[PDB]
Amino acid sequence: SMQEEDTFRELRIFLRNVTHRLAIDKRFRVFTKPVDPDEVPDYRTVIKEPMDLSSVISKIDLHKYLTVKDYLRDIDLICSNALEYNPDRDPGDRLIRHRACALRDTAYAIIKEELDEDFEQLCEEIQESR
Numbered sequence: 001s002m003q004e005e006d007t008f009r010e011l012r013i014f015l016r017n018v019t020h021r022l023a024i025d026k027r028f029r030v031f032t033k034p035v036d037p038d039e040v041p042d043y044r045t046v047i048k049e050p051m052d053l054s055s056v057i058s059k060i061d062l063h064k065y066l067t068v069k070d071y072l073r074d075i076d077l078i079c080s081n082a083l084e085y086n087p088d089r090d091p092g093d094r095l096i097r098h099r100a101c102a103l104r105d106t107a108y109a110i111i112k113e114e115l116d117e118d119f120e121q122l123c124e125e126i127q128e129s130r
Helices: 002-024 026-031 053-061 068-085 091-114 117-129
Strands: none
Touching: 002 026, 002 053, 002 068, 002 091, 002 117, 026 091, 053 068, 068 091, 068 117
């Protein structure tokens, strides 16, 4: 349907705008790019599914998100990976964990404020029809 394609275009516009807000926030700079495997060689041994905001943007543009919940699962993963990899008492680890939690809380708060519930339901019903 043209109506269905329009819906997913509106979704991608919305997700890009949310992700941009997160990516320009100074607190979340550490989450904007993939962890560099030459810099942190053990990261991909600990973290099975890396995720970062540049990868999220690429997924939006490659039509990988058909619902808001699918997007939020990747926000969850950015947060959970950070908590898993940086668990220690050290202030540097505590700072990363605080920022990871703030990233997730901020994303959910933006979506709660701005997402029309019938729009997400429509995205879900289209997704479930294909």
